[PDB]
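Human: Can I borrow your eye for a moment on a structure tokenisation matter? Separate attempts, laid side by side, tell us more than any discussion would. Could you pick a protein and write out its sequence and tokenised fold? No explanation is needed for now; the record alone will do.

Assistant:
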Amino acid sequence: ICVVQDWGHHRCT
């Protein structure tokens, strides 16, 4: 799970 930083996401699934 990963939804932190809305303006700066990373690469979940």
Notes: The chain has no helices and no strands. The two ends are 9 Å apart (CA to CA). Residues 2 and 8 are 12 Å apart (CA to CA).
